[PDB]
Design a protein around this ligand. Structure first.
Ligand SMILES: CCCCNc1ccc(C(=O)OCCN(C)C)cc1
Ligand SMILES: CCCCNc1ccc(C(=O)OCCN(C)C)cc1
Lengths: 154, 154
């Protein structure tokens, strides 16, 4: 599932990680689990790369991180340069309310439901759950509006 | 949601904790989270109480535990004696394949999908997810057949 006709410039700005799901419990279990990452801001570049500002709990504190996802020939697919080739996939967005994405290796998967506002969007969560229905996810987390306004959703 | 016409004697024997969900991430997050409990065996007593054999990861090892849930005037509701009054609710069972239950305080909630066999029962999981749809759950875990045959689902 990919977003046809994605305009990456229109995903700019503030986002909340309302929900997260992953193929492996260990990817999301603890506050310090590897893919327990809280999106803050998406900053698409003029050349169409994607800078991601996020928070991650590591070494007993809520740390700031900056990821750059490089564009590919497919608008809805980005690459993160590391020891491993990992793909960022944009499944679905309306730009103004929700965005669904997955991070996949070469498989392990973590996906999130991003929303624009610190509110539980049952409709976005329905799109999120329907997107994942056939994906092999074994852990799903969702956050309340109080948590969404805290550093690392504490 | 309670099981009408529950015969507690018919839930005896081997069960697998195929899936678990809870109101609070912290109840299920880590292997050592309080309600990360793996059912082994249900042993109803002649007088209609329920002994539960389970495993729980505590102090760096998979520990054996025995819980007794006392019957109430409602067949599908049991009480666990502690500092807190906690209710065990039997939502649904066919005795031969699946059983859904919740543990609730006075609220925080943890629920499980129990199955008779180390197999992913998509139908039981559908009943589980439909039962929880309006419950305020923020963490959901499910286990693969390999994990289901390991002590504490490692
Ligand atoms: C619209 C796309 C949003 C993408 N958001 C994110 C993309 C990646 C990550 C992320 O945490 O990536 C780290 C994994 N690397 C090191 C392989 C977190 C959020
Ligand atoms: C058919 C009913 C099955 C009930 N199964 C279980 C019931 C209770 C627990 C359980 O872990 O209870 C501990 C909580 N106490 C100390 C308040 C675990 C499993």
């Amino acid at each position: 599932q990919t977003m046809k006709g994605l305009d990456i410039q229109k995903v700019a700005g503030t986002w909340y990680s309302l929900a997260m799901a992953a193929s492996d419990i260990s990817l999301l279990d603890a506050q310090s689990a590897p893919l327990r990452v809280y999106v803050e801001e998406l900053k698409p570049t003029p050349e169409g790369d994607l800078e991601i500002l996020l928070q991650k709990w590591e070494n007993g504190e809520c740390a700031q991180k900056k990821i750059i996802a490089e564009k590919t020939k497919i608008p809805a697919v980005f690459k993160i340069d590391a020891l491993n080739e990992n793909k960022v996939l944009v499944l679905d967005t309306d730009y103004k309310k929700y965005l669904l994405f997955c991070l996949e290796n070469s498989q392990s998967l973590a996906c999130q439901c991003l929303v624009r506002t610190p509110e539980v969007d049952d409709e976005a969560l329905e799109k999120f759950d329907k997107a994942l229905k056939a994906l092999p996810m074994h852990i799903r987390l969702s956050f309340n509006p109080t948590q969404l306004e805290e550093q690392c959703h504490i």
